[PDB]
Amino acid sequence: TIDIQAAAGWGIAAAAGAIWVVQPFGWI
Amino acid sequence: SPPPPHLMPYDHAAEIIKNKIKKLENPDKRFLKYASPHPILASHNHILSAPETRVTTLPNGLRVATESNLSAKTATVGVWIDAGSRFESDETNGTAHFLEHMIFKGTDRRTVRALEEEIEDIGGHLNAYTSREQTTYYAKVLDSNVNQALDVLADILQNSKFEEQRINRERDVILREMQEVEGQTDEVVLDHLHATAFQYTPLGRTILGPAQNVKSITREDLQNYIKTHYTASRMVIAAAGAVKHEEVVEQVKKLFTKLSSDPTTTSQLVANEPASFTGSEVRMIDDDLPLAQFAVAFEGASWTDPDSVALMVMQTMLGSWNKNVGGGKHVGSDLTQRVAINEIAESIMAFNTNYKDTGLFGVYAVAKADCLDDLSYAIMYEVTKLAYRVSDADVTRARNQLKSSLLLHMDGTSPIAEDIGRQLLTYGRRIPTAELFARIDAVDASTVKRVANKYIYDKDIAISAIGPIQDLPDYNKFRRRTYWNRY
Amino acid sequence: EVPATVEAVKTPNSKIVYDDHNHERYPPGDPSKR
Amino acid sequence: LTSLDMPLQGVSLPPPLADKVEPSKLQITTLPNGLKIASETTPNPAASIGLYVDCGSIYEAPYFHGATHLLERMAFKSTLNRTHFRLVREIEAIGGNTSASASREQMSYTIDALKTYVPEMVEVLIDSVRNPAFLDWEVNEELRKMKVEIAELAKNPMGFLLEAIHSAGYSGPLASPLYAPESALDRLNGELLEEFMTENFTAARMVLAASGVEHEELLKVAEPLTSDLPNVPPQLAPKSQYVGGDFRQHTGGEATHFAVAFEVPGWNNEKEAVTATVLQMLMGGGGSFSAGGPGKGMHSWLYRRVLNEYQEVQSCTAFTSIFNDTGLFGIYGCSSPQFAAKAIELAAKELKDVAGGKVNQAHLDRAKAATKSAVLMNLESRMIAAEDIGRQILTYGERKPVDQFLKSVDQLTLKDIADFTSKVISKPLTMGSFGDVLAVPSYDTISSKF
Amino acid sequence: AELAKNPMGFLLEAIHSAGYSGPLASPLYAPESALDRLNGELLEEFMTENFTAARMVLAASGVEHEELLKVAEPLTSDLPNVPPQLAPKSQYVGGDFRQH
Amino acid sequence: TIRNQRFSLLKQPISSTLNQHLVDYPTPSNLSYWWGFGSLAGICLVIQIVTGVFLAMHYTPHVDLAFNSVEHIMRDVEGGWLLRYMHANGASMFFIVVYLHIFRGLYYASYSSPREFVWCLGVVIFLLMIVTAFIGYVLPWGQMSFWGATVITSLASAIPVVGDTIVTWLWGGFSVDNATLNRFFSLHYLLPFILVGASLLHLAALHQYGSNNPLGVHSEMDKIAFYPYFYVKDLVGWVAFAIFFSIWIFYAPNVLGHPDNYIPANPMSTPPHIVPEWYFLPIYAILRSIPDKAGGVAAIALVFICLLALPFFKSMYVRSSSFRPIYQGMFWLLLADCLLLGWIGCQPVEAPFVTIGQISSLVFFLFFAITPILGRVGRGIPNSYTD
Amino acid sequence: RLVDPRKNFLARMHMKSVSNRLRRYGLRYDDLYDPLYDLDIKEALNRLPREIVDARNQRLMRAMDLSMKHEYLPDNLQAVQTPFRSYLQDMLALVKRERAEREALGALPLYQRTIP
């Protein structure tokens, strides 16, 4: 039951990286 | 017309192999009724019955522990002492091993020949073994000679002469032993592992000691050692086999009268000179040796730490194997499977060493030079996997194997007496089998993951290697392979 | 005489001294700096 | 949890065993096909179950050279009912350990586990010996690991010499090697193993000895799996003749070795077996390569003479290999490549010295006590108990009590030791040397010493 | 290594050591253990004490004696005159070889 | 052997890798002329690179000069008409030789294990070839160049959120203009070198296992050296390709293209027949058939997804169409369907061609839908067809 | 099943066409199974007796020689060919069964394919 937690962690990482490259604060 | 399917030699061989395979296709169910390849945790506290282990404390703190089997024709009686190289000093280091050599060298009543003639006249055996934290002297004798063996042990412990010529002869025996530290490379590798891992602590010293210390050894040194360490509260007299508790207690009360009674106590000694782990390595490069031997270790657990049981289960999970084992490719241990399937070692062995305040948990391997890189990768992978992925089947199988080995190795008077003495020194009690089994079955997959994350994950390691080890990975690569960056 | 490597292999040393020109070690038994 | 110095709370402690437990009695059940099942109940929670077969290298002649040791390596592999992988997994599920041993006149298959797993142990053991699949890839793998097991043989001078003088001491079946040459292995295969095993593994030649199980359960599990076996009438083991002989492999270099052996009675003849064992204890000795632990034989004639009167000796002791109708008593030795002649002189002189009567009663009582304590102590082990039951029921069918052996040991006088050693060395000797044999004397010169 | 392939010569060598005792039982073909110790100095010691003039014969078929002496004398006359040593004595004793 | 002395110079470290990868590399002895199209593809790539480098010395990437610089090459550069026709028809030649290569791979099941990575690299190479040739066709800046650029750069508008942003980023503005042409020219110089690298990786991946053969069997027992046997075999194909290419260059230089690209680009008017090069016609037909903009882009991407997923489908163990009659028929149907799709792409969007294109795209996708089930069913052939 | 020649005549035509195509080259259907396609085939081939594998390899060499020469077998040789006489399928199925048993009990694979 650790692969699901790894997937969630890496999904959070991917989201953080997305908001960081494109920085869509003027669109949200 | 084509040939019939037995004319050509290759067609005939194909038919034969096909017939054998069809024979294997249909199993017989009378032989498939009981055994299962799936491990099940079983509770069998009925067969776990054992004779009572009686423990009596004398007024001076001496403990007498007996396990009676009056159907036996033999017995093992001995003394287990909370003493060893760890409790010496830097300048006294090696004295315990010298005493082990000197203890059967004669007393006021008995000369060397008298002592050997008395023993081997009854067909007995006398054994002396000293380690870092434990020392034991014991006799294997017939049931009749229990009192005689106890008298022999009490005499050698209390009334040894230590003649100067005997001391000088043993001095050269031990000096040659130090000059001949070869041929037992496992022991050498573990000594160097202890020396680097427990650097600047009493636990890092060898049992043998330095050559200057043995050269400097005199009578008063040995007498002072016995006075300082062989005290009533640090000694356990253990007997197993055809022995009655009451007779042994009376004999011990009669014979063990002139002990030391020094106030020095082992807990304080460990407290003021504690043992700590230092991540480090020693590489003894010798390209003329045909095989490489190395050990990788983490800091382990002490005897009384609850995690020690889980570390025993984990050691069983890693397992041990050599090239003469028939079924290494099929065992439950993934590390053994990798090693046996790819032929990447001569031998592999996981160890779990416990001490009073620390321990060592690691793997010892023997392999050829060109296998070292893959072997190191496999060892680190399977050790680090314990922190991430543990199947219920693997931990169940390891629990079953550990319980079986603990009960099966306990055969004979000598192993039972050793178990009694060791447990009384390390735990203060002989842990009954039912309690030990209950502690073992409390180790589930989540427990193994927790313990591995405490002891193995992102942790410093100690390495000791000797031989053609130029292709053994360096300290940084072993240290990196303690965590997985995909999690 | 015995060469130094043979003596080192035959006599484990728990009082190891590391080279200190570039780095000074923390006291032995110190917690890791990871 | 709690520290191991504090008892765990809430544990169900089984009641303790009595300090005096009445020993159980061997029950021997014979099946109509001739298979004998024996067991003894034991108080400890471990069961040892074995199958013992009166097959060995003395049946390989002439067309099965190497079959016995290959069968030893092929033990507990794939059956017709289970794959090797499944069988290893079933053994490990219950924390069991397997073992197989091959000798000139006996083979054994044993499994050890807690006594609650007896049905699984019995089932796995019989499937293994009755239904070998003998798959070609498994046989080929065990044959590659047979080449290593035979090449590393030169690394054990005692074992190498022991086999070599077995070869050089007999002529018939007993002379067939227990470690076949490499040429003799390029012929062995699964079909050969099947043909050999089917011929020799019969019910009337096999014993199921189980130490630590109730006979009812063992019968309930084992009867339905062995009765099918047909009745095969009891043949006779072949005869071997002891002769003289010399074994010599001049390899050169250093660290010579030798073994001078003579013929002694077999396991049949139950007063002289003992005379051989007590003789072996009397000469005694030690490996001279390691020390530690008084009472292991440091004050026997061999030790006290050689290792305490002549230095530069690397090994010196005595050995024994008794078969059903014959045996080999001998003395080992290492010495130095040019000291070899003196070493053989010393050994021969020691044999002659005990032959004449130069041994006093103190040494006789010492060796007698050593014999009795060695036999009584070796029965501490459950494994040895089970193996002894199996071997004795194979050989005698009775399991004679140890007390009879103890009286024979304590009925030995000096006149017996003297006449037996005189008889033993009045017959042809078997000489074997290994290493640098150039300085080692001839067979005739050594034979003339006795 | 390529000697067991010829049983004739292998047996002829083996029965020399199996039948004689002493120097004549010394193998002409040494085992592959005395070879790891053979070196140029061990061969130079062996040759200096054995290759002496009194144990040497220079024989020629197809040559005149005069100029043969003319060439040979300056290259051999300076060899030291060493006493003749007695031949090492061997003893036939009989014996048995065997190898399976 | 102890290499104390120098033997043959080809085995020296200066040329050992070229000797082992190009001269002595073992090759199945039964390879047909169908196996000579990879080298033809490589020679086409080299021809394109050399001719383009020498054409770029005279071309101006500006909207006021691009068309006129292309006409200045045709008219004023000594040898210029031959540089242009070789490059323009070379592009068509590359696509012909690469299509035959791909269909050779599909008939022998060359994509199957162990050569899946070879096929995936090939698909990436095909994508690179399409992008390179498209942006190259925009450089002349004729009518077809401008309107073809206007559509493919609008394909990003199928994305709901950022689609218009992506369209205006690729354009460099609010319309196809000088910025688009300049960035296309830069991309069009760079992409062929990435194609060279991808081809090198393709060949290395193939040489990990060696080439498949027309029997589809293991071939270790009958392999021969590439030089000189397959060298001369490939040389025959090279000379024949030269004859074919020369016919196109010297006698039919403009029949492979459209006359509309000879009109300077007009953003006001629009040609009534806006087509791509013939080698993009099947893709463009599959795009026009779906009646939803997004569904069309999805279908185009699904084409390449299907190509990439082909090697990994669980299949039967037989490779060659030589021993798979049903798969062989599926092949001859797929080839007819692709030629139908290409023809339909040139047809205007009007009945009956709309329905024909829809059915043809459906059949194209059915090939990939049906191949795995055939593999699963045919895994049981050896049990069923016994002796 | 529809792939049964005795029950379905389409399968009969399919089997006849495959047999005729195999017989032209002297190939068995099991000869089309390549060790490089899967590690299970490689293992099954390694478990077969040597003479069978040598016969397979000889047939493969003969077929490659015929294909390179644009030739078929002579009709006299074609008459004695046994295109559907099996030597591999049973061993392949046994290897698959052992593989599945290993997977079910949580053991590591005995062999794995290299990542290209």
Ligand SMILES: COC1=C(OC)C(=O)C(C/C=C(\C)CC/C=C(/C)CC/C=C(\C)CC/C=C(\C)CC/C=C(\C)CC/C=C(\C)CCC=C(C)C)=C(C)C1=O
């Ligand atoms: C009627 O209508 C139609 C036509 O008209 C006549 C046609 O002609 C066609 C045929 C055309 C095709 C089949 C081509 C279709 C497919 C594609 C993908 C074309 C190719 C598309 C492109 C132009 C893509 C070009 C690529 C880029 C702009 C890449 C941009 C970015 C770059 C260079 C780098 C990115 C930057 C970074 C990652 C930052 C860091 C960079 C570093 C290198 C460090 C069709 C279908 C059609 O319906």
Ligand code: HEM
């Ligand atoms: C720039 C374009 C390409 C070049 C230069 C090229 C080159 C080559 C070469 C030289 C070979 C080896 C010889 C041969 O069989 O032809 C080869 C093999 C192969 N190529 Fe390509 N290729 C290209 C594009 C593609 C594409 C687009 C695909 C498929 C999507 C592909 C798939 C393959 C396959 C499967 C093989 C193995 C063929 C076999 O062994 O039968 N290639 N390629």
Ligand code: HEM
């Ligand atoms: C680095 C290599 C290349 C360079 C420098 C280059 C350069 C050029 C230039 C300057 C033009 C404009 C002049 C003209 O149209 O004739 C052009 C056109 C073109 N190029 Fe390339 N090119 C290269 C490679 C390629 C490749 C590999 C392809 C094929 C995929 C290709 C396909 C085209 C096409 C289709 C045209 C339009 C031709 C026309 O109709 O006029 N080019 N190229």
Ligand SMILES: COC1=C(OC)C(=O)C(C/C=C(\C)CC/C=C(/C)CC/C=C(\C)CC/C=C(\C)CCC=C(C)C)=C(C)C1=O
């Ligand atoms: C046995 O296997 C082999 C094949 O398969 C059966 C082949 O088909 C071929 C023939 C085909 C080849 C080599 C294809 C060409 C190679 C590639 C990677 C495709 C495209 C190559 C280009 C564009 C070359 C550009 C690279 C350059 C110029 C590099 C710089 C080097 C120099 C200037 C010397 C060969 C030699 C081969 O052995």
Ligand SMILES: [Zn+2]
């Ligand atoms: Zn010691």
